[PDB]
Amino acid sequence: RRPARCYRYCKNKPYPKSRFCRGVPDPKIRIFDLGRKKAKVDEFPLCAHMVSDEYEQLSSEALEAARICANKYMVKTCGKDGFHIRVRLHPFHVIRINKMLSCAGADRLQTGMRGAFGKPQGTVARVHIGQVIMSVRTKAQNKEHVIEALRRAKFKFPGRQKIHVSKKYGFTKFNTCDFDNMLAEKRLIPDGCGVKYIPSRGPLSRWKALH
Amino acid sequence: AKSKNHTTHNQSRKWHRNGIKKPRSQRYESLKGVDPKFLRNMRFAKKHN
Amino acid sequence: TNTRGKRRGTRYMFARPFRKHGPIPLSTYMRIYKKGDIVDIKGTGTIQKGMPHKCYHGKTGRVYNVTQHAVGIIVNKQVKGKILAKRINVRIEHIKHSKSRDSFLQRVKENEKKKVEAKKEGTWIELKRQPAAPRPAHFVSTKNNKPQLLEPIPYEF
Amino acid sequence: VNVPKTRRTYCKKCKKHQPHKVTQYKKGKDSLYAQGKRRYDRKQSGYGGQTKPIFRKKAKTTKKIVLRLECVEPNCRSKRMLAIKRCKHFELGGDKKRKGQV
RNA sequence: GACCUGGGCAUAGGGGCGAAAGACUAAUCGAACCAUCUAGUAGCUGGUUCCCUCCGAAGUUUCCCUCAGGAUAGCUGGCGCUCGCCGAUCAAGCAGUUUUAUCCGGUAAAGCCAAUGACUAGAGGCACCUAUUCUCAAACUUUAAAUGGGUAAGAGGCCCGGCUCGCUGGCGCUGGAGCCGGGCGUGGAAUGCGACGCGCCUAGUGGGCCAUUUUUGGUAAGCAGAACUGGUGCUGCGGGAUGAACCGAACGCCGGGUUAAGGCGCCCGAUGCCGACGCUCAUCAGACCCCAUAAAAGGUG
RNA sequence: AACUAGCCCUGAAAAUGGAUGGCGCUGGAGCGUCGGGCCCAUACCCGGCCGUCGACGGCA
RNA sequence: UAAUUAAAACAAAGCAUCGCGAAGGCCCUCGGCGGGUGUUGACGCGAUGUGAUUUCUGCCCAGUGCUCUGAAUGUCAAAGUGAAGAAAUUCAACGAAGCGCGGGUAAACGGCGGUCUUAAGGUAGCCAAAUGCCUCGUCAUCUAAU
RNA sequence: GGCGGUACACCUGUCAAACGGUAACGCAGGUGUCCUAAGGCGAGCUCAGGGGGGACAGAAACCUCCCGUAGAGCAGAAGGGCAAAAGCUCGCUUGAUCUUGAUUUUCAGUAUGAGUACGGACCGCGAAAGCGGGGCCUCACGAUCCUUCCGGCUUUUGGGGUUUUAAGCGGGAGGUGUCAGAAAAGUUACCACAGGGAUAACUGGCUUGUGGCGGCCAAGCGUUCAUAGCGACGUCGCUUUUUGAUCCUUCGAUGUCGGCUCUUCCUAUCAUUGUGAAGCAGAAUUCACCAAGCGUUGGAUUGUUCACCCACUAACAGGGAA
RNA sequence: GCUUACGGCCAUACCACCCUGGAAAUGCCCGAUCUCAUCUGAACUCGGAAGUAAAGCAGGGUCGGGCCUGGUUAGUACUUGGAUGGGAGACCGCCUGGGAAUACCAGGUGCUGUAAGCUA
Ligand SMILES: [Mg+2]
Ligand SMILES: [Mg+2]
Ligand SMILES: [Mg+2]
Ligand SMILES: [Mg+2]
Ligand SMILES: [Mg+2]
Ligand SMILES: [Mg+2]
Ligand SMILES: [Mg+2]
Ligand SMILES: [Mg+2]
Ligand SMILES: [Mg+2]
Ligand SMILES: [Mg+2]
Ligand SMILES: [Mg+2]
Ligand SMILES: [Mg+2]
Ligand SMILES: [Mg+2]
Ligand SMILES: [Mg+2]
Ligand SMILES: [Mg+2]
Ligand SMILES: [Mg+2]
Ligand SMILES: [Mg+2]
Ligand SMILES: [Mg+2]
Ligand SMILES: [Mg+2]
Ligand SMILES: [Mg+2]
Ligand SMILES: [Mg+2]
Ligand SMILES: [Mg+2]
Ligand SMILES: [Mg+2]
Ligand SMILES: [Mg+2]
Ligand SMILES: [Mg+2]
Ligand SMILES: [Mg+2]
Ligand SMILES: [Mg+2]
Ligand SMILES: [Mg+2]
Ligand SMILES: [Mg+2]
Ligand SMILES: [Mg+2]
Ligand SMILES: [Mg+2]
Ligand SMILES: [Mg+2]
Ligand SMILES: [Mg+2]
Ligand SMILES: [Mg+2]
Ligand SMILES: [Mg+2]
Ligand SMILES: [Mg+2]
Ligand SMILES: [Mg+2]
Ligand SMILES: [Mg+2]
Ligand SMILES: [Mg+2]
Ligand SMILES: [Mg+2]
Ligand SMILES: [Mg+2]
Ligand SMILES: [Mg+2]
Ligand SMILES: [Mg+2]
Ligand SMILES: [Mg+2]
Ligand SMILES: [Mg+2]
Ligand SMILES: [Mg+2]
Ligand SMILES: [Mg+2]
Ligand SMILES: [Mg+2]
Ligand SMILES: [Mg+2]
Ligand SMILES: [Mg+2]
Ligand SMILES: [Zn+2]
Structure with missing residues (x-):
């Protein structure tokens, strides 16, 4: 296909x-969750991201290639059920x-250039x-293995990416310093891979179901 | 031999050259378009005062 | 090019507010519009009769003719570089009384209310409006309000 | 498109709503002694060929139907031309619709 | 030999003649020459003749067998005229500007655990169902700016009385409108300005181009197409070596002074400061808007 | 030890001989942050003159 | 093809078709029933195609064109005819050639297919040709190599 | 340019940058119709969908209950709007009628078309208030001339009268889709003229999709062993020896393919000089570096650049210079 | 305070469930002769007054859903105007002004006009 310099x-x-x-x-990437995706919140506390530094568009082929590059390194360094x-x-x-202009x-x-509006080529x-x-x-x-797995996948992406170990607990939106305190107060309940926020502003019957 | 289709580039400078004058609302504005029944009685109220 | 349709581009201006559909509240029908009063123009898609054109939605004019269900308005419309006085017929569902001159009429009655007091007291209280004047000299006390030291926070990614 | 053969419309000569007999209008025979026909033959006579334009590129598929409204009043049988919108199929007798049928 | 050749003859222009090439018909042939109609027409090239003074454009709108042209509006000029200042910012009136007040909008953003549509993952409950979750919209949106559009900021007002009406109607005052009279300047935001007032006639132009930003098609283009504004065309001058458009600044003829942008080793006016601190060695160093290319990735320099 | 940020280096190949403009510059004439002084545009200020315009202008 | 093309182009004999018996065919002239063919008469004149000889010249008359009928039902001018009307006029019947309908005709223009199918479905021949894109076809031969 | 297409007259959403306006052969679509009701009015009714049920009867026939903001329907494209409506059903209807002007949109603020608010007639529906002069709104259409029809005690047919005829006035229709509206098939390689670099076929310039060339990461290949030599999935570049894209220069002309000839230049190095590396024992070969000093052939076929083959050779490297 | 008639704004008014209440009034309710009305007196229409709170209705309740308001988000996002600012670019910083939204959190949950009537 056409190089990614043209649709960057x-x-x-x-x-x-x-x-x-x-x-x-169909986009090149069809699977977005890998590893032991059916894991609880307390099993994978650490979280690291591949944050983008530039305002660009990544092709679906690059997302698929970087996914495979990051997946293969996590299996050989942490096992097939040691990451998500x-x-x-x-x-x-x-x-x-x-x-194809001839x-x-x-x-x-x-x-x-007569009628130049082109057909769909791919997805970014x-x-x-x-x-x-x-x-x-x-x-x-x-x-150390996650930082390296994400570092190798940056070479499959154009531009500049940053590998940042988040302070959040897992894939949730709550900090690690506040996560274990909210579980004790029954404000968070494990719901699949993450937690579900339970406020103190519903029917009291739902409060009795937790205690 | 294609040319330029449409433009409003120099138009604003041409509009304000002689100024964009608001319509002069003269005193005792005209009575064209008013209700014919209303005008008919109004012309009867003027020929009897 | 575009089409010259009378409602091209009126997808959102003639639509009704969210959770404000249905019948028009009847207070809008029982508002009296005399001749020479300032009214706004806000078309409604519910009443497809007597609708103003999209160029008058949001404009303001005065009434010159009143009919059974509608009102004649004299509105200003800039075509290219000239402003023309347009006489449009709009039903009362698309118009409302303009509160623009209400602040003026409130000040007129208040000006006549304060100057007759001068003829009965002997003062010269100024009636003209004035722009926001520079703030006068004032003392800022620090008795129970000590200046708190602020500092730029470090960077966090 | 079917319109009934009877119409109780306004009669301009009766100054009142009267029943009318609706009939489709037909052009009629062109007179050989109309002024435009007399000078068209004078112009086409002799040598010179076709002196007037002959319209060729027609585009309309149908035409506006005209209704000849004749008043049924015995003393006032006044006609009136009433044109309706363009329709490809026009019938005057017609059979009225029935909803709850097959 | 269907040979070559003289002279005399015949065929004349849309005609001749042609063992055919549109060949030949007096250096002229896909229609000879001469004169005339004729100074044929050309929306098309070319040119269009003295000086100074003042004002000064347009490549946009609509229509056109229009798109190399016209008509038309706009822009232009000229001619005035009505006034105002004179005769007291008298005050009005006006404004590519604010202020105050009042409306208008659905773009940026945001949102989808809100609707429409798209999309990922588990989890709970008896493939669905419920509660959550990842990621999106230009032709989606609850929500919603900035900038912006309209209007109102007084005597053409405000208040009061009487009168008229065939319209309106329980109610000549029930509405409404009109007419007439009277009362009240502390002209009741800021700033600026004589009214860019009222006309008439009117040339040129109707190929534009460029830049910041916004923005469509395109891999992109010194590409094509738009929006706001400026510039340019029409414009020289200082600076960017050079230059259409960048930067500064627009121009009567001069002297002095001082600047802008940009510069001050030498070319080349100006640091020939005892300028401050640091960084940097390149066996392709580096050297300033537009701008005259350089990246991913690397270095125990 | 990891990471990061400046300058420099590698990455970095085109045809006539050539281009921070040239010379050349390396305690710099380079890069970044700045100070003082200085240089001149048909710009600004003061004055002279020319013309145009305006004068709520001056004289029979 | 004078003055860029001498040729495979033209002509050619041969072959074949077409028209015409003279009040004719073909053609000329503004015109004379004037003129050419024609001082001619079908072994002739005029109009085309093909192109010596040899060998053959298939199939298609649907289309187009030409031509032949008129037990020719239509379409159908001027004039003439009938009727109505004060008349202009209107209406009606009649109604040539030609068209339409029918037949013939391809050495007339032309055409000559993938159980489907038309009008006939390319026959005898010939060929990668002066005609074949794909293509510098495949094989053989010709050369160290084409 | 031609072919195609219609961006030629219109309509919806978007483009469009929150008034309006705003372009491209921008995007996604629609139109030359349809309807005596699918027009008008009144009354009653509630839809789509889902669930529980109920002889035949089932995933879908019909009855019934519950929930149901409309998620249905409203002739059509789309947007908007609509719940005792604008939807459904029903029964009464011809406001889809006759007229004058104002007015909105496109706009020059012209016509036409399509709309709005009135006034004046005559009516429909409803108990009535009221609603309606077509379609819930935004689209569904046409000048002059001519023809035709309708309308008028009202004109002219002129030296008068009567009667035909004709003309005219007012309103429809017959149509111009190139839709503000000529009546219109080619070919020219025999060509001509006025022009155009407003506009194609060269070079050059911008761009580099494509072509060519070189990197980064390291799944994997290499018996084992990512990186001797290679490099999947991705990704960053360079080059102007490909082809396009563009139409800036040139149409009062820049001579147009190839070969021959001849000079110089580039290196992205085939050979030769000096080297490093190997999956380098030798020989041969491969990778890489400094490096363009020097060399890079003779032929068969084709007009060929490009190919292919014959031999020779250290090698028979690739290119530029209009 | 409450019950009705007509309303205004049109959820702070809605929705689910629970509880309480009949003084007047309201509603259910009782009938089909008449008017009228349907397959069916269910509805509609009409006639009536045996019962009185089951429902409607009203008023409470719910760490209720929704809705409303405010806070937080946030001077964040975005944005007017400016530079010979940075960066190869993508984009970003600053200057000058304007200034959001969700999540989250908290509060609240009909107000009121005219007319008539009644103090459980
Ligand atoms: Mg154009
Ligand atoms: Mg133009
Ligand atoms: Mg459109
Ligand atoms: Mg329209
Ligand atoms: Mg309507
Ligand atoms: Mg004749
Ligand atoms: Mg001789
Ligand atoms: Mg001639
Ligand atoms: Mg020829
Ligand atoms: Mg002349
Ligand atoms: Mg053109
Ligand atoms: Mg020209
Ligand atoms: Mg002009
Ligand atoms: Mg003009
Ligand atoms: Mg352009
Ligand atoms: Mg200028
Ligand atoms: Mg200038
Ligand atoms: Mg320069
Ligand atoms: Mg000076
Ligand atoms: Mg210098
Ligand atoms: Mg780097
Ligand atoms: Mg390396
Ligand atoms: Mg470098
Ligand atoms: Mg001076
Ligand atoms: Mg010759
Ligand atoms: Mg010869
Ligand atoms: Mg021959
Ligand atoms: Mg023979
Ligand atoms: Mg033949
Ligand atoms: Mg035949
Ligand atoms: Mg042929
Ligand atoms: Mg055969
Ligand atoms: Mg138009
Ligand atoms: Mg805007
Ligand atoms: Mg319509
Ligand atoms: Mg009426
Ligand atoms: Mg006659
Ligand atoms: Mg046209
Ligand atoms: Mg050009
Ligand atoms: Mg490529
Ligand atoms: Mg292996
Ligand atoms: Mg690759
Ligand atoms: Mg151009
Ligand atoms: Mg020459
Ligand atoms: Mg030249
Ligand atoms: Mg030359
Ligand atoms: Mg090299
Ligand atoms: Mg290697
Ligand atoms: Mg109870
Ligand atoms: Mg709640
Ligand atoms: Zn009648």
């Missing part, structure tokens, strides 16, 4: 696959390609400065 900058408005943009090929990689960028922006012809309705994920690309939650002693 968010130059056009977001052009999603919808009722109007028909004929989009979550690609947090879904390719929704559809990039277009113009016709010398001339008595057909194709054009030869040059418009990422923002500070937006997480990939997230990996592992055990506390696997920090």
Whole structure:
């Protein structure tokens, strides 16, 4: 296909696959969660992200290639059930390609820029400065392997990425310094891979079900 | 031989050259378009005072 | 190019507010619009009769003609570089009384209320409005309000 | 499109709503002694060829139907031309619709 | 030999003649030459003749068998005229500007645990169902700016009385409107300005181009197409070596002074300061808007 | 020991001989942060003159 | 093809078709029933195609065109005819050639297919040709190599 | 340019940057219709969907209950709007009628088209208030001339009268889709003219998709062993020896393919000089570095650049210089 | 305070469930002769007064859902204007002004006009 230098900058408005943009090929990446995705919150406390530093658009092929690069390194260093990689960028922006412009012809309705609006070529994920690309939650002693697994996957992406070990507990939105205190007060309950926030502002029957 | 289709580039500078004058609301504005039944009685109230 | 349709681009301006659909509240129907009063123009998609054009939505004019269900308004419309006085017929569901001159009429009655006091007291209290004057000289006490030292916080990624 | 053969519309000569007989209007025979026909033959006579334009590129598929409304009043049988919108199929007798049927 | 050739003859222009090439028909042939109609027409090239003074554009709107042109509006000029200052910022009136008040909007952002649509993951309950979760919209949106659009900031006002009406109607005052008279300047935001007042006639132009920002198609383009404003065309001058457009600043002829942008080793006016602190060695160093390319990735320099 | 940030280096190949403008500059004439002084535009200020415009202008 | 093309182009004999018996065919003239063919008469004149000889010249008359009928039902001018009307006029019948309908005709223009199918479905021949894109086809031969 | 398409007259959403306006052969669509009701009015009714049930009867026939903000429907494209409506059903209807002007949109503020508010007639529906002069709104359409029809005690047919005829006045229709509206098939390689670098076919310039070339990461190959030599999935570049894209220069002309000839230049180095590396024992070969000093051939076929083959050779490297 | 008639704003008024209440009034309720009305006096229409709170209705309740208001988010996001600011670029910082939204948290949950009537 066309090199990623041509569809790197968010130059056009977001052009999603919808009722109007028909004929989009399937994105290269179809799986976004890997590892032991069916793990509890207290099993993978650590969390590290691949934060984007540039306002660009990553192709679905790069998201798929970096996912495989990060997945293979986590298996050989932490086991197939010692991590949970979550690609947090879904390719929704559809990039277009113009016709295979040739010398001339008595057909194709054009030869040059006449009717230049192109057909859907692929899908990219418009990422923002500070937006997480990939997230990996592992055990506390696997920090060196996650930083290296995400560092190798940066080479599959254009631009500049930063590997940041988050202060949040796992894939939740609560800090580690506040997580274990909220479990004791029954304010958070484990719901699958993460926790579900339970406020003190519902029916009291739901409060009795916790205690 | 293609050309430029539409432009409003120099128009604002041409509009304010002689100024964009607001319509002069003269005293005793005209009575065109008022209700014909209302005007009919109004012309009867003027020929009897 | 575009179409010259009478409602091209009116997808949101003629729509109704969220959770404000249904019948028009009847107080809007029982408002009296005399001749020469200032009214706003806000078209409604519910009443498809007597609608103003999209160029008058948000404009303000005075009433010159009153009918059974509608009112004649004299509105200013800039075409290219000239402003023209347009006489449009709009039903009362698309208009409302303009509170623009209400602040003026409130001040007129208040000016006449304060100057007749001068003829009965002998003062010259100024009636003109004045822009926000520079703040006068004041003392800022620190008795129970000590200046707190602020510092720029370190960076956190 | 079907319109009934009877219409109780306004009669301009009766100054009142009267029943009318609706009939589709037909153009009629062109007179050989109309002024435009007399000078068209004078212009087309002799040598010179076709002197007037002959319209070729027609685009309309149908035409506006005209209804000849004749008043049924015995003393006032006044006609009136009433045109309706363009329709490809126009019938005057017609059979009225029935909803709850097959 | 369907040979070559003289002279005399015949065929004349849309005609001749042609063993055919549109060949030949007096150096002229896909229609000879001469004269005339004729100074044929050309929305198309070219040129269009003295000086100074003042004002000064347009490449946009609509229509056109229009798109190399016109009509039309705009922009331009000229001619005035009505006044105001004179005769006291008298006050009005006006404004590509604020202020105050009042409306208008659905773009940025935000949101989808809110609807429409798209999409990831587990979990609970008896494939669904419930509570959560990842990620999105230009033709989605509860919400919602900045900038912006309209209007109102007085005597053409405010208040009061009487009168008229065929309209309106329980109620000549029930509305409403009109007419007439009277009362009240502390002209009741800021700033600026004589009214860019009222007309008439009117040339040129109707190929534009460029920059910041916004923005569409395109891999991109010194590409194509838009929006605001400026510039340019129409414009020289200081600076960017050079230059259409960048930066500064717009121009009668001069002297002095001082600056802008940019500079001050030498070319080359100006640091020929005993300038401050640090960084930096390059066997392709580096050297300033536009701008005359350089990246990912690396270095125990 | 990891990471990061400046300058420099590698990455870095085009055809006539050549371009921080040139010379050259390496306690600099380079880079970054700044100070003082200084240089001149048809810009600004003062004055002279020319013309135009305006004068709520002056004289029979 | 004078003055860029001498040729495979033109002509050619041969072959074949077409028209015409003279009040004719073909053609000329503004015109004369004037003129050419024609001082001619079908072994002739005029109009085309093919192109010596040899060998053959298939199939298609649907389309187009030409031509032949008129037990020719239509379409159908001027004039003439009938009727109505003060008349202008209107209406009606009649109604040539030609068209339509029918037949013939391809050495007339032309055409000559993937159980489907049309009008006939490329026959005898010939060929990667002066005609084959794919293509510098495949094989053989010709050369160290084409 | 032609072919295609219609961006030629219109409509919706978006583009459009929160008034309005705003372009491209921008995007997603629609239109030349349809409807005597699918118009008007009144009354009653509530839809889509889901659930519980109930002979035949089932995942879908019909009855019934509950929930149901409309998630249905409203002729059509889309947007908007709509719940005792604008939807459904029913029974009464012809406001889809006759007229004058004002007015909105497109706009020059012209016409036409499409709308709005009135006034004056005559009516429909409803007990009534009221509602309606077509379609819930935004689209569904046409000048002059001519023809045709309707309308008028009202004109002219002129030296008068009567009667035909004709003309005229007022209003419809017959149509111009290139939709502000000519009546209109090609070809020219025999060509001509006025022009155009407003506009193609060269070079050059910008761009580099494509072509060519070089990197980064390291899954994997290499018996084992990522990195001797290679490099999947990705990704960053360079080059202007490919082709395009563009139309800036040139149409009062820059001679147009290839070869021959001849000079110089570039290195992205085939050979040769000096080296490093190996999955380097030798020989041969491969990778890489300094490096363009020097060399890079003779032929068959084709007009060929490009190919292919024959031999020779240290090697028979690739290019630029309009 | 409450019950009705007509309303205004149109959820602070809605929705679910629970509890309480009949003084007047309201509602249910009792009937189909008449008017009227349907497959069916259920509805609609009409006639009535045996019962009185089951429902409607009203008033409470719920760490209720929704809605409303405010805080937080946040001077964050975005944005007017400026630079010969940075960076290869993508973009970012600053200057000058304007200034959001969700999550989250807290409070609240109909107000009121005209007319008539009644003090459980
Ligand atoms: Mg154009
Ligand atoms: Mg133009
Ligand atoms: Mg559109
Ligand atoms: Mg329209
Ligand atoms: Mg309507
Ligand atoms: Mg004749
Ligand atoms: Mg001779
Ligand atoms: Mg001639
Ligand atoms: Mg020829
Ligand atoms: Mg002349
Ligand atoms: Mg053109
Ligand atoms: Mg020209
Ligand atoms: Mg002009
Ligand atoms: Mg003009
Ligand atoms: Mg352009
Ligand atoms: Mg100028
Ligand atoms: Mg200048
Ligand atoms: Mg320079
Ligand atoms: Mg000086
Ligand atoms: Mg210098
Ligand atoms: Mg780097
Ligand atoms: Mg390396
Ligand atoms: Mg370097
Ligand atoms: Mg001076
Ligand atoms: Mg010759
Ligand atoms: Mg010869
Ligand atoms: Mg031959
Ligand atoms: Mg023969
Ligand atoms: Mg033949
Ligand atoms: Mg035949
Ligand atoms: Mg042929
Ligand atoms: Mg055969
Ligand atoms: Mg138009
Ligand atoms: Mg705007
Ligand atoms: Mg319509
Ligand atoms: Mg009426
Ligand atoms: Mg006659
Ligand atoms: Mg046209
Ligand atoms: Mg050009
Ligand atoms: Mg490439
Ligand atoms: Mg291996
Ligand atoms: Mg690769
Ligand atoms: Mg251009
Ligand atoms: Mg020359
Ligand atoms: Mg030249
Ligand atoms: Mg030359
Ligand atoms: Mg080298
Ligand atoms: Mg190697
Ligand atoms: Mg109870
Ligand atoms: Mg709550
Ligand atoms: Zn009648």
